[PDB]
């Protein structure tokens, strides 16, 4: 149970980091798309 709770905490933090990276990448993509305009 202790290992499982630690794994869930790490997974939640990983998902948060991944979604922040995703939104940053989308922002950069939109900026480059505007540049190509």
């Amino acid at each position: 149970q202790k290992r499982k709770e630690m794994q869930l905490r790490q997974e939640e933090e990983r998902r948060r980091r991944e979604e922040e990276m995703m939104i940053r990448q989308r922002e950069m993509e939109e900026q480059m798309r505007r540049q190509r305009e």
Binding site: R34, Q35, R36, E37
Partner: protein, 51 residues
């Protein structure tokens, strides 16, 4: 019929040049500091034209 809005925003830099609203600058700022240089250039051009 001058330059319309549709042709203005085609260039990608036009929209990013309008974030600052039209203003009268502000004493002590860089824009006001260099607007004096621009006004000096305008004045010397006017003097040359009058000559």
């Amino acid at each position: 019929d001058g330059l319309p809005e549709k042709l203005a925003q085609k260039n990608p830099m036009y929209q990013k040049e309008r974030e600052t609203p039209p203003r009268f600058a502000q004493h002590g700022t860089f824009e006001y500091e260099y607007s004096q240089r621009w006004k000096s250039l305008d004045e010397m051009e006017k003097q040359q034209r009058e000559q």
